Write an enzyme that holds these catalytic residues in place. Sequence first.
Site, PDB file in Angstrom:
ATOM      1  N   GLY A 266      -0.012   2.689   5.415  1.00  0.00           N
ATOM      2  CA  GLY A 266      -1.287   3.307   5.078  1.00  0.00           C
ATOM      3  C   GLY A 266      -1.189   4.509   4.159  1.00  0.00           C
ATOM      4  O   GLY A 266      -1.790   5.556   4.444  1.00  0.00           O
TER       5      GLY A 266
ATOM      6  N   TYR B 233     -11.646   9.369   0.697  1.00  0.00           N
ATOM      7  CA  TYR B 233     -11.540   8.665  -0.576  1.00  0.00           C
ATOM      8  C   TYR B 233     -12.729   8.909  -1.492  1.00  0.00           C
ATOM      9  O   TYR B 233     -12.759   8.377  -2.603  1.00  0.00           O
ATOM     10  CB  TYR B 233     -11.340   7.164  -0.310  1.00  0.00           C
ATOM     11  CG  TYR B 233     -10.183   6.981   0.639  1.00  0.00           C
ATOM     12  CD1 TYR B 233      -8.867   7.106   0.188  1.00  0.00           C
ATOM     13  CD2 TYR B 233     -10.403   6.771   1.995  1.00  0.00           C
ATOM     14  CE1 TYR B 233      -7.793   6.990   1.072  1.00  0.00           C
ATOM     15  CE2 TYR B 233      -9.346   6.658   2.880  1.00  0.00           C
ATOM     16  CZ  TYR B 233      -8.044   6.759   2.410  1.00  0.00           C
ATOM     17  OH  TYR B 233      -7.001   6.651   3.282  1.00  0.00           O
TER      18      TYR B 233
ATOM     19  N   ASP C 293     -12.652  10.274   6.209  1.00  0.00           N
ATOM     20  CA  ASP C 293     -13.149   8.943   5.869  1.00  0.00           C
ATOM     21  C   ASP C 293     -14.233   8.450   6.807  1.00  0.00           C
ATOM     22  O   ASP C 293     -14.744   7.343   6.596  1.00  0.00           O
ATOM     23  CB  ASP C 293     -12.013   7.901   5.803  1.00  0.00           C
ATOM     24  CG  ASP C 293     -10.862   8.159   6.778  1.00  0.00           C
ATOM     25  OD1 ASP C 293     -10.979   8.922   7.762  1.00  0.00           O
ATOM     26  OD2 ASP C 293      -9.814   7.515   6.563  1.00  0.00           O
TER      27      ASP C 293
ATOM     28  N   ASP D 205      -9.721  11.021  12.299  1.00  0.00           N
ATOM     29  CA  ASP D 205      -9.740  10.095  11.176  1.00  0.00           C
ATOM     30  C   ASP D 205     -10.442   8.793  11.583  1.00  0.00           C
ATOM     31  O   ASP D 205     -10.454   8.412  12.752  1.00  0.00           O
ATOM     32  CB  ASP D 205      -8.292   9.843  10.730  1.00  0.00           C
ATOM     33  CG  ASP D 205      -8.189   9.244   9.373  1.00  0.00           C
ATOM     34  OD1 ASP D 205      -8.208   8.002   9.304  1.00  0.00           O
ATOM     35  OD2 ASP D 205      -8.053  10.005   8.385  1.00  0.00           O
TER      36      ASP D 205
ATOM     37  N   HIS E  67      -9.376   6.014  11.036  1.00  0.00           N
ATOM     38  CA  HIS E  67      -8.308   5.094  11.419  1.00  0.00           C
ATOM     39  C   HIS E  67      -7.553   5.604  12.650  1.00  0.00           C
ATOM     40  O   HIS E  67      -7.402   6.811  12.863  1.00  0.00           O
ATOM     41  CB  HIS E  67      -7.349   4.876  10.238  1.00  0.00           C
ATOM     42  CG  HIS E  67      -8.021   4.300   9.017  1.00  0.00           C
ATOM     43  ND1 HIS E  67      -8.559   5.084   8.017  1.00  0.00           N
ATOM     44  CD2 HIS E  67      -8.283   3.017   8.662  1.00  0.00           C
ATOM     45  CE1 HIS E  67      -9.082   4.313   7.080  1.00  0.00           C
ATOM     46  NE2 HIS E  67      -8.939   3.051   7.450  1.00  0.00           N
TER      47      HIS E  67
ATOM     48  N   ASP F 191       0.802  -1.221   0.000  1.00  0.00           N
ATOM     49  CA  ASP F 191       0.000   0.000   0.000  1.00  0.00           C
ATOM     50  C   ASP F 191       0.838   1.276   0.000  1.00  0.00           C
ATOM     51  O   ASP F 191       0.263   2.369  -0.103  1.00  0.00           O
ATOM     52  CB  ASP F 191      -0.966   0.015   1.185  1.00  0.00           C
ATOM     53  CG  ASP F 191      -2.029  -1.049   1.073  1.00  0.00           C
ATOM     54  OD1 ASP F 191      -2.498  -1.315  -0.059  1.00  0.00           O
ATOM     55  OD2 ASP F 191      -2.384  -1.631   2.119  1.00  0.00           O
TER      56      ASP F 191
ATOM     57  N   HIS G  62       0.086   7.726   9.846  1.00  0.00           N
ATOM     58  CA  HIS G  62       0.474   6.318   9.960  1.00  0.00           C
ATOM     59  C   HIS G  62       1.972   6.068   9.756  1.00  0.00           C
ATOM     60  O   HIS G  62       2.429   4.945  10.023  1.00  0.00           O
ATOM     61  CB  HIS G  62      -0.275   5.453   8.912  1.00  0.00           C
ATOM     62  CG  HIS G  62      -1.761   5.339   9.131  1.00  0.00           C
ATOM     63  ND1 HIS G  62      -2.311   4.949  10.334  1.00  0.00           N
ATOM     64  CD2 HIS G  62      -2.799   5.508   8.280  1.00  0.00           C
ATOM     65  CE1 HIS G  62      -3.628   4.907  10.222  1.00  0.00           C
ATOM     66  NE2 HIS G  62      -3.948   5.240   8.983  1.00  0.00           N
TER      67      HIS G  62
HETATM   68  C1  LIG Z   1     -12.192   3.400  -2.925  1.00  0.00           C
HETATM   69  O1  LIG Z   1     -11.558   2.271  -2.435  1.00  0.00           O
HETATM   70  C2  LIG Z   1     -10.674   2.413  -1.379  1.00  0.00           C
HETATM   71  C3  LIG Z   1      -9.282   2.441  -1.590  1.00  0.00           C
HETATM   72  C4  LIG Z   1      -8.393   2.599  -0.500  1.00  0.00           C
HETATM   73  C5  LIG Z   1      -8.925   2.697   0.812  1.00  0.00           C
HETATM   74  C6  LIG Z   1      -8.076   2.926   2.036  1.00  0.00           C
HETATM   75  N1  LIG Z   1      -7.040   2.087   2.650  1.00  0.00           N
HETATM   76  C7  LIG Z   1      -6.509   0.865   2.406  1.00  0.00           C
HETATM   77  C8  LIG Z   1      -5.510   0.640   3.383  1.00  0.00           C
HETATM   78  C9  LIG Z   1      -5.458   1.813   4.250  1.00  0.00           C
HETATM   79  C10 LIG Z   1      -4.711   2.240   5.387  1.00  0.00           C
HETATM   80  C11 LIG Z   1      -4.951   3.492   5.975  1.00  0.00           C
HETATM   81  C12 LIG Z   1      -5.941   4.354   5.439  1.00  0.00           C
HETATM   82  C13 LIG Z   1      -6.319   5.773   6.009  1.00  0.00           C
HETATM   83  O2  LIG Z   1      -7.265   6.414   5.508  1.00  0.00           O
HETATM   84  N2  LIG Z   1      -5.641   6.384   7.117  1.00  0.00           N
HETATM   85  O3  LIG Z   1      -6.031   7.543   7.509  1.00  0.00           O
HETATM   86  C14 LIG Z   1      -6.651   3.909   4.335  1.00  0.00           C
HETATM   87  C15 LIG Z   1      -6.401   2.649   3.754  1.00  0.00           C
HETATM   88  C16 LIG Z   1     -10.301   2.701   1.010  1.00  0.00           C
HETATM   89  C17 LIG Z   1     -11.195   2.546  -0.070  1.00  0.00           C
HETATM   90  K   LIG Z   2      -8.491   8.688  14.455  1.00  0.00           K
HETATM   91 ZN   LIG Z   3      -8.201   7.079   7.564  1.00  0.00          ZN
END
Ligand SMILES: COc1ccc(Cn2ccc3ccc(C(=O)NO)cc32)cc1
Ligand SMILES: [K+]
Ligand SMILES: [Zn+2]
Length: 396
Positions: free
Chosen positions: A147, A310, A267, A175, A177, A97, A139
Amino acid sequence: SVGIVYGDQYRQLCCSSPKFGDRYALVMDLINAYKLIPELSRVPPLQWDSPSRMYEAVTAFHSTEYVDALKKLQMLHCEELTADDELLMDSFSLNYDCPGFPSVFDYSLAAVQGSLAAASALICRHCEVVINWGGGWHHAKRSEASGFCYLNDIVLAIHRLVSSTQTRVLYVDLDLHHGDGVEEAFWYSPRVVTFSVHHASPGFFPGTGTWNPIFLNGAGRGRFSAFNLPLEEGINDLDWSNAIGPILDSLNIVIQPSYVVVQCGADCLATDPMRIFRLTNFYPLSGYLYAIKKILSWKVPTLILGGGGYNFPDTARLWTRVTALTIEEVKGKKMTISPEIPEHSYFSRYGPDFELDIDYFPDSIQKHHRRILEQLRNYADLNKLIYDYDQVYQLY
Ligand SMILES: COc1ccc(Cn2ccc3ccc(C(=O)NO)cc32)cc1
Ligand SMILES: [K+]
Ligand SMILES: [Zn+2]
Ligand SMILES: [K+]
């Protein structure tokens, strides 16, 4: 004044990654579309006198061999990797990622330049609040990307704030996360209190911020200084607001921070493709706008930073209102936003209704609340802090 980080080269760098694409540009063009830029002080990204000065600034948190690896990965993507180069990148989690791409180092460094300049604007009192929607990469670790975070601009910003002078920083992470990288960086530091509210569940990234069973919350002199509130999926504006509001207020009272740094990842929106939380950008109430208005009524110099998000237009819809709200609360000056999206470069991305509101239909917490109040008293006992006990108790 209220400051905001942007610039012509900064915009290009923030829009050069394959995961976040032109998101930064929809955000800043909607803000501009709503005539908020003349109310705002442009804060220019920080630049350095030499490679050495840049490395010295970044390795205030990251290791040199990590920064070297990240620079080599950009160079390697401007020309396949050898087996030895893949091992090298793999040892820094610069894969999966967090892959390489031709501007990965300039892209990552950009958010750091932005958030360091934002801290400096608060320090020299040019700005009471500064917004950096290009930042918020919570992250990233000392020697590890995670991330889609490569460099931890928040850590670097907070480090700059605590070394500006007893300075205390309160870090608030909205967030979806858990903000693990910022929490880890300050695990042993009592002068930087960190608080993250997030979804946590088995298998859900990054995995921390929850029971371990007990909550870990700091170590050494930093014991009791890392706070966490994990919530179940589906939570709406009102319950997430009621969940965090007394914790925020009690943290301000007891800690009396010299600065607040807020990560405002979008998000949690009901319309994010993640679809975990059901928050909105509504302003009649958005969980996000409730929290920021709360934090801003403390009148503490504050850094507002981006994060995940996103659904690019709906992140823009949220951060535009956060931006307008900050201006209202700081300058005391009414901000009138039309419910319809103004015509501008990205007008077509806001279809097919072209409104500013997002397109959505709107016991455990009391255990966590008692858990956190004891931790807060332990923190205050550990650090010889003054406060009225049942003044913070009554907030709940
Ligand atoms: C639209 O589809 C998507 C594509 C990617 C993601 C997000 N995603 C995958 C792993 C990961 C780790 C951290 C975070 C984050 O937002 N941290 O703040 C997002 C991540 C979702 C949907
Ligand atoms: K948070
Ligand atoms: Zn997030
Ligand atoms: K801490």
